[PDB]
Design a protein around this ligand. Structure first.
Ligand SMILES: COc1cc2nccc(Oc3ccc(NC(=O)/N=c4\cc(C)o[nH]4)c(Cl)c3)c2cc1OC
Length: 305
């Protein structure tokens, strides 16, 4: 079914309306790099007037770096088109503009999320956590983050997109405890990142991948639900690495097929752990949908109050 088909697949037919999205290069001041991959990078910048008249705005800019080729340039352009087509949501990193004019690099400009990726943030807060003192993390915050990511994913699903690398490292934290789904893509160095394992010529986030994705190489929204379950484990471990100490080999993949699951993380509630287990159902059609996760986490959020 073409309607099931992720817009990600046929991006080349998506419009780029420059009269709306093009931002003048002479209004963007590039600062220091925030992160770098092999072929891509994200740079901190100040954009003059990009979202509000005459207002300086700190933004993040994704662009390529030494090593990239025309194929990565094409990939970044497709990413830009995808972001445009998806549209705005509180819990997805918001596109502000782009520089596509010849004579300089392709630049994708998005809102700056000052606290960075959620995994690192949660670990820096282990010292400042109480289950139920200002600036302290609490259980309510953890549930609220989970709810927000479910909302963003429900939204992405509704725009006919699937993420394919959902993990705490791809969630960013902005001010006022708002989290945003991201995909660093080329701006992450995956051959240097332990989270990505060599399988063939590819490097894959095995510890986050559903069984059907590992064995049959199928990516669906329900396999994102499986990954969301792992993300939940990350959140309620305050940013621990999944399957700690475990060797991620073919025996690991088999155990996973058999029904082996992670034990509960140190900060979970019973209901949150059952939710993870639900997300990790061997049968994809028996996992909850993101719509159901949204309703359920909202209920948990209210009960925790
Ligand atoms: C404080 O430190 C950082 C703050 C950041 N704040 C905002 C954005 C950042 O990096 C990006 C991460 C991802 C994308 N792209 C992106 O998310 N593309 C998508 C997402 C989806 C669904 O389809 N395409 C971009 Cl442009 C930029 C940041 C990186 C930081 O430190 C490294």
């Amino acid at each position: 079914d073409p309607d099931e088909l992720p817009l990600d697949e046929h991006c080349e037919r998506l419009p780029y309306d420059a009269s709306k999205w093009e931002f003048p290069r002479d209004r963007l001041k590039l600062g220091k790099p925030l992160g770098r991959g092999a072929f891509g990078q994200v740079i901190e910048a100040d954009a003059f007037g990009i979202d509000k008249t005459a207002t300086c705005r700190t933004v993040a800019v994704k662009m390529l770096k030494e090593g990239a080729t025309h194929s990565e340039h094409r990939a970044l352009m497709s990413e830009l088109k995808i972001l445009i087509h998806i549209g705005h949501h509180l819990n997805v990193v918001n596109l502000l503009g782009a520089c596509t004019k010849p004579g300089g690099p392709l630049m994708v400009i998005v809102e700056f999320c000052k606290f960075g990726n959620l995994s690192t943030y949660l670990r820096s807060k282990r010292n400042e956590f109480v289950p139920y003192y200002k600036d302290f993390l609490t259980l309510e915050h953890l549930i609220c983050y989970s709810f927000q990511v479910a909302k963003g994913m429900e939204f992405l699903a509704s725009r006919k997109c699937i993420h394919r690398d959902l993990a705490a490292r791809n969630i960013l934290l902005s001010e006022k405890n708002v989290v945003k789904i991201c995909d660093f893509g080329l701006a992450r160095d995956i051959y240097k990142d332990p989270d990505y394992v060599r399988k063939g010529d590819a490097r894959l986030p095995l510890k986050w991948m559903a069984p059907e994705t590992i064995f049959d190489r199928v990516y669906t929204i329900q396999s994102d639900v499986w990954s969301f379950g792992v993300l939940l484990w990350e959140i309620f471990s305050l940013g621990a690495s999944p399957y700690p100490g475990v060797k991620i080999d073919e025996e690991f993949c088999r155990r996973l097929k058999e029904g082996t699951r992670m034990r509960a993380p140190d900060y979970t509630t019973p209901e949150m752990y059952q939710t993870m287990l639900d997300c990790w159902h061997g049968e994809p059609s028996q996992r909850p949908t993101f719509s159901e996760l949204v309703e359920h986490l909202g209920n948990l959020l209210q009960a925790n109050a």
